[PDB]
Design a protein around this ligand. Structure first.
Ligand SMILES: Nc1ncc(Cl)c(Nc2ccccc2)n1
Length: 130
């Protein structure tokens, strides 16, 4: 459906989430992926534009005239790959699968990737356990 937005335009309620859904479908089928992210010898294929849109670290890398052409990016080998996988799924879905058993790895990975809204959110959930 659609509605009249604050600017008097027609606004499509599901458009942004539908675009993201379609980008995730492309990722799952490996269509137009243009980078591999390597974490602890695990490989993750993705779209650079989605990475940049969600992460300060990826934004900096892919706006750098030298690094923007790399098709393989290695992360710190101490990064937990499940932490990365969770954040990558978040990027492509808006859904963050936080659990007691993964929250610290997810928070550390989000800090490394410069995903500040995710970092803040992990803080509140940790602080509520205390
Ligand atoms: N199912 C699917 N998966 C991925 C993409 Cl990118 C896509 N795009 C698209 C297809 C038809 C009409 C409008 C958009 N559709």
């Amino acid at each position: 459906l659609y509605f009249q937005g604050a600017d008097s335009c027609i606004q499509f309620t599901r458009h942004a989430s539908d675009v993201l859904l379609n980008l995730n479908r492309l990722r799952s089928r490996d269509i137009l992926t243009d980078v591999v992210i390597v974490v602890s010898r695990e490989q993750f294929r993705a779209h650079k534009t989605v990475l940049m849109a969600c992460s300060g670290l990826f934004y900096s890398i892919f706006t750098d005239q030298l690094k923007c052409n790399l098709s393989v990016i290695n992360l710190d080998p101490e990064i937990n790959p499940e932490g990365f996988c969770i954040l990558l799924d978040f990027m492509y879905t808006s859904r963050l699968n936080l659990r007691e058993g993964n929250i610290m790895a997810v928070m550390a990975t989000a800090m490394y990737l410069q995903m500040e809204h995710v970092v803040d959110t992990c803080r509140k959930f940790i602080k509520a356990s205390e």
